């Protein structure tokens, strides 16, 4: 509703945006820790496989 | 009658109108308490059932 006490749709959207920021922060921490932008097959499978074979 | 001591038709109508106001007040109290305009199947069965399934 517009003046609801049971549902806070604005808080749900704010939670989604905070989760997006936290996921970006986790990615940057992995890059700082490994020194790699592609550190596993999850980052980019084709380039990861090429680098492994090379 | 017009000047009767046994029957007060005006008091009967006034009682009916007071009962109408009391029923409206009970409905508003339920909305304030639950935070819901449709809080049970008695308020609106189709919309209540849709909201339950969703």
């Amino acid at each position: 509703a517009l003046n609801s006490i049971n549902t806070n749709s604005g808080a749900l959207i704010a939670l989604q945006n905070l989760n997006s920021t936290n996921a970006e922060l986790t990615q940057v921490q992995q890059r700082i820790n490994t020194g790699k932008k592609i550190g596993s097959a999850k980052d980019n499978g084709a380039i990861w496989a090429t680098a492994k074979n090379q």
Side-chain angles (χ1 to χ4, degrees), chain A:
Chain A
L2 264 195
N3 296 274
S4 163
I5 63 180
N6 291 317
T7 299
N8 198 335
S9 74
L12 297 177
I13 312 274
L15 285 153
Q16 295 171 1
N17 300 324
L18 181 56
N19 291 327
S20 265
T21 301
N22 290 333
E24 298 170 65
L25 194 45
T26 302
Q27 194 215 265
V28 178
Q29 297 162 208
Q30 294 171 306
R31 296 199 182 181
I32 289 154
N33 207 350
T34 65
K36 271 160 195 226
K37 65 198 192 267
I38 294 150
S40 79
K42 277 174 297 127
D43 299 316
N44 189 319
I47 303 188
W48 174 88
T50 298
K52 281 261 146 171
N53 293 114
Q54 179 172 335

